[PDB]
Design a protein around this ligand. Structure first.
Ligand code: CA
Ligand code: CL
Ligand code: CL
Ligand code: CL
Ligand code: CL
Ligand code: CL
Ligand code: CL
Ligand code: CL
Ligand code: CL
Ligand code: CL
Ligand code: CL
Ligand code: CL
Ligand code: CL
Ligand code: CL
Ligand code: CL
Ligand code: CL
Lengths: 224, 224, 224
């Protein structure tokens, strides 16, 4: 009955709880970036735009690669408003209280685990969407799933540009961080499962690859 | 009969006179930029391309956001040729005569007023076009109208790159100039009018918001 | 019977031999770039991506200008794999043997000539494709044919960014190299032939303009 558990696991509604956790962890990372708090005070619109890149960069990059509107996902009003609320609470909550609660390590690890659930689903969805337009476009499936999982990291040079920062000597392709490298392995696995060359159900691969990401990310977050 | 006046005002043919005024003021601003005259002499093709960004950047950015060909508007041969003539006359007219005439303050203020007529129509058109593709895409309507009104300012970092200039420490989002900020207020107003939450006719909002832009821009141009 | 020869010349199958020659010459140029060998060792994925830009940048830029998926051409699995093989053999062949063979001047000049065959066909194809979407879009035809022939040169600033290099003081538009300038002349000629204002068959223009590019490029390669 393991496949029955995997089917329920791979079909959990990511909206709104799992998307919120994704938004919280991502906007938390934004606040850690140099000058982010100063930017929220002096340039609140650019600060919000930065947070939307962190929350939705996966869809912005996938749509760009597939020639679709890069802000197509912003037609999802409930998601945009929910991410906007997370940005506001993290940067402007009185007593900084929301930050204090979601930074509590037991609470933060849970949100980190829930974000990985969303990232794996995102990779698989990117592969399947590209496949729908290109039945044998293996390289297009791999590219789309990769940017769906990496998110804002693959546009980090230009996320920095928006913030008034320019560091051209490195980029996430030249030197991949773990989530970028892991999303590349993930997109190959999901593309191989799409090819029917990897003899495993789509629900089992989602389950096992998410558990891999959850263990890695929770361990990396608890260590530092 | 104020609505009868507003209907005639909001439906005046922008081509070719009002578009020409837009092109003149924009290419004048280009000539004010550092190295612009030198660039027209040594790199005349890049100089013309820069002028096309100033004249058509509104359509280039809107089409990019909506996933349409970024040079789609360049199929409008008469408009492209008219902007090309304005660029040539401003940079290469014997005796610099065309520049002298259009820089005459009474003449320049009129062209500045006529450009604002075109900008407001552009914002409204961006909102209505996004709405046609996304009936409830409020954030897509706001983004499209914003870039239609801001024009080349929102791509200023890359207009500078084309010119051989790189100033990453600032951008029009991080620090909005008045036309960028005003186009953001404008696009919210036109989106609210699209939502039917703002109880005002589309022709009246065009009239009153254009008069607001005309007074502000004429006053700002005459002061300096 | 010159038109009978020109028809056979303009319809030769570019895949796979003529495309391979294009890939070889382009990836050779990549290896000449500063830090390229070091990058292939430390960042092999970015190195491969750079080589794909050199091999396919024509299609990436044309698709971008026309609002189509920028990686649409990567659905051509055989072409992508063939370019990947060329990249691997040039950077990782034991004894560097593949490099030694294709760098042999008599062999290199032939590959240089065959690449020009592919470039001219690319320019003409860009013009005809834009024409199909815009029957009278002269400026769109010219832009599309231009980027099809110039290839990665028009994205050189961002090919450098991928490599960790940033040199904003120059770009291929501000200062055109010979292949960029020649592709601009070529796209005007093919657009004029599309307009029916240039009284010459499409096969004759391909033949004569390719011979022009072959003589120029072979002479430029043999001189230095
Ligand atoms: Ca598109
Ligand atoms: Cl940073
Ligand atoms: Cl602001
Ligand atoms: Cl998704
Ligand atoms: Cl997707
Ligand atoms: Cl098919
Ligand atoms: Cl400047
Ligand atoms: Cl030039
Ligand atoms: Cl418009
Ligand atoms: Cl529009
Ligand atoms: Cl609908
Ligand atoms: Cl370089
Ligand atoms: Cl790598
Ligand atoms: Cl082609
Ligand atoms: Cl094409
Ligand atoms: Cl038509």
């Amino acid at each position: 009955q393991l496949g029955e558990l995997a089917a329920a696991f791979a079909s959990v509604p990511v909206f709104p709880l799992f998307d919120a956790a994704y938004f919280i962890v991502s906007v938390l990372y934004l606040k850690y970036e140099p000058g982010a708090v100063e930017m929220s005070r002096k340039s609140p619109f650019a600060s919000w735009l930065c947070a939307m890149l962190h929350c939705f960069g996966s869809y912005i990059l996938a749509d760009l690669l597939l020639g679709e509107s890069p802000i197509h996902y912003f037609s999802n009003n409930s998601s945009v408003i929910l991410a906007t609320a997370v940005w506001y609470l993290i940067f402007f909550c009185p007593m900084n209280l929301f930050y204090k609660c979601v930074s509590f390590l037991p609470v933060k690890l849970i949100f980190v685990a829930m974000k990985e659930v969303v990232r794996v689903r995102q990779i698989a969805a990117g592969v399947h969407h590209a496949h729908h337009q290109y039945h044998h476009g293996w390289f297009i499936m791999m590219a789309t799933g990769w940017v769906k999982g990496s998110g804002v990291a693959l546009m980090s040079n230009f996320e920095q540009l928006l913030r008034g920062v320019w560091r051209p000597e490195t980029n996430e392709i030249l030197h991949m961080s773990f989530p970028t490298k892991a999303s590349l392995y993930g997109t190959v696995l999901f593309t191989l499962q799409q090819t029917h060359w990897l003899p495993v159900s789509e629900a089992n691969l989602v389950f096992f690859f998410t558990m891999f990401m959850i263990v890695c990310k929770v361990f990396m977050t608890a260590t530092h």
